[PDB]
Design a protein around this ligand. Structure first.
Ligand SMILES: Nc1ncnc2c1ncn2[C@@H]1O[C@H](COP(=O)(O)OP(=O)(O)OC[C@H]2O[C@@H]([n+]3cccc(C(=O)O)c3)[C@H](O)[C@@H]2O)[C@@H](O)[C@H]1O
Ligand SMILES: Nc1ncnc2c1ncn2[C@@H]1O[C@H](COP(=O)(O)OP(=O)(O)OC[C@H]2O[C@@H]([n+]3cccc(C(=O)O)c3)[C@H](O)[C@@H]2O)[C@@H](O)[C@H]1O
Lengths: 189, 189
C-alpha cells in the first residue's frame, strides 16, 4: 500500500554510504522510491557548526541527480528550529495518508533511538529500517526491521577530516560532490 | 627503498573492495604503486570450480584500467599448479632485489595466515598489511602492519550470488566489470 523509504540526515557531505543503504533498502523491501530528507538543524547536534543549508542541499542534489529512484523531501528545510523527526513525520503522514513510511537509519542511529524526541509516538508513524554499520551494532529494544547489506564504514566526519588533512577520498563519495567541495573550498579543501 | 604493494586474489569478480583497499594502502604507506596478482589456481580453494583465467584477467584489467597507480603482475598465471604465495614471492624477491613488498590482505585472510604454505619463511620475504573487513577481526600472532580504512563488506561470493538471484549490484563493483559479466552471462547473469 504505497511503500516509501525515507533516509534523513545532515548530508555534510553526502557520500556513497547514503546512496548504498538507500539502494539496498529500496530493493530489499520493494519500495516505490526513497526520499532523502535533509535536516535544517540536526536535532541532536544543535550546537555543532555545520555547512549551510544551501551548500548541503546542493551537494545532496548532485549526489542524487541521475538516480531515478531517489528524490529529495524539503519538509524540514521549510520550517524553523531543530528538525525533530517526530514533527516531520506527523506532518508527512497527514499529507500522504496512504503511504507506509520506512525510515532508514544506520547502526549508529539505531543505538541512539532512546534519545529521539517522542520515539514511542514516532514508532506508530513509521517503520524503522536499520542497516549495519562498522563500529556499531543493531542493538535496540524497539521493533526495527533489519536489512542485510554489504557494510561500508565511510562517514562524513572521516571525509571532512580527510579533506582538511588533504587525504584521499577516492571511492568514498560521488565525483560531482567531490568537485563541488574542492571548488567551494569546503572542509578546508 | 622502493615500496610496492601487492594484493593477491582470485578476483572472481574483482569489485570496489579490492580497489578501495589498494588505494587506501597505497596512500597510507606512500607506496610507489600497487600490483594486483591474480592466482591461477587459488591455493586454498583447489577444488572450487571458478571462472576461467582468461575471464578473470579480463575483468581485472577492466577494473584497473584507468587507475594509473595500479598494474597487474602475471607471475602466477605464468606457472602451473596451485599458486602458493611463498613461491610467488621467492621469485619476485629475486627478480626485484631492491623492492620492499607489502602484501595486502583483508581481515578474513589475516585470520587464515596459519594455514598458509611456508608462512614463517614468507614473513621474511614480505611485510603483510592487514585491513579490516566486516565479519572478520585483525587477530593474528604474526607481525602484520595494520592500516585503518573505511570498511566495506562487499564480496565476490555475495556478488556471484546476487547475479544468480538477479539482485542489485549497484555501487559494489565497476560499471565496466558489470557490463562484461552480464554480456558473457557469468554467475548466471
Ligand atoms: N557508512 C554508513 N553505513 C550505514 N549507514 C550510514 C553510513 N553513513 C551514514 N549512515 C546513516 O545515514 C543516515 C544519515 O547520516 P547523517 O547525515 O550523519 O545524519 P544524522 O545526523 O545521523 O541523522 C539521522 C536522521 O535521524 C534524525 N534524528 C537523529 C537524532 C535525533 C532525532 C530526534 O528526532 O530526536 C532525529 C535526523 O534528523 C536525521 O533525519 C543516518 O541514519 C546514518 O546512520
Ligand atoms: N570487502 C573487502 N574488504 C577488505 N578486504 C577485502 C574485501 N574483499 C576482498 N578483500 C581482500 O582482497 C583480497 C583478494 O580477495 P580474493 O579474490 O577472495 O582472494 P583470496 O582467494 O582470499 O586470496 C588472497 C591472497 O592470499 C593468497 N593465499 C591465500 C590462502 C593461502 C595461501 C598460501 O600460499 O598458502 C595464499 C592467495 O593466493 C591470494 O594471493 C584478499 O586479501 C581479501 O581478504
Amino acid at each position: 500500500m504505497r511503500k516509501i523509504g525515507i533516509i534523513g540526515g545532515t548530508f555534510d557531505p553526502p557520500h556513497y554510504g547514503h546512496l548504498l543503504i538507500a539502494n539496498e533498502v529500496y530493493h530489499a523491501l520493494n519500495l516505490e522510491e526513497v526520499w532523502f530528507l535533509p535536516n535544517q538543524i540536526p536535532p541532536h547536534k544543535q550546537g555543532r557548526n555545520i555547512t549551510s543549508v544551501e551548500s548541503r542541499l546542493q551537494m545532496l542534489e548532485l549526489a542524487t541527480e541521475a538516480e531515478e529512484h531517489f528524490s529529495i523531501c524539503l519538509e524540514e528545510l521549510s520550517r524553523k528550529g531543530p528538525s525533530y523527526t517526530y514533527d516531520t513525520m506527523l506532518q508527512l503522514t497527514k499529507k500522504y495518508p496512504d503511504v507506509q513510511f520506512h525510515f532508514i537509519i544506520g547502526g549508529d542511529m539505531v543505538e541512539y533511538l532512546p534519545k529521539w524526541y517522542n520515539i514511542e509516538a514516532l514508532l506508530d508513524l513509521v517503520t524503522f529500517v536499520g542497516v549495519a554499520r562498522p563500529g556499531y551494532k543493531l542493538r535496540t529494544p524497539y521493533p526495527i526491521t533489519t536489512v542485510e547489506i554489504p557494510e561500508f564504514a565511510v562517514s562524513s566526519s572521516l571525509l571532512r577530516e580527510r579533506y582538511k588533512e588533504k587525504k584521499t577520498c577516492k571511492y568514498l563519495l560521488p565525483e560531482k560532490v567531490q568537485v563541488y567541495i574542492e571548488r567551494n573550498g569546503l572542509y578546508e579543501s
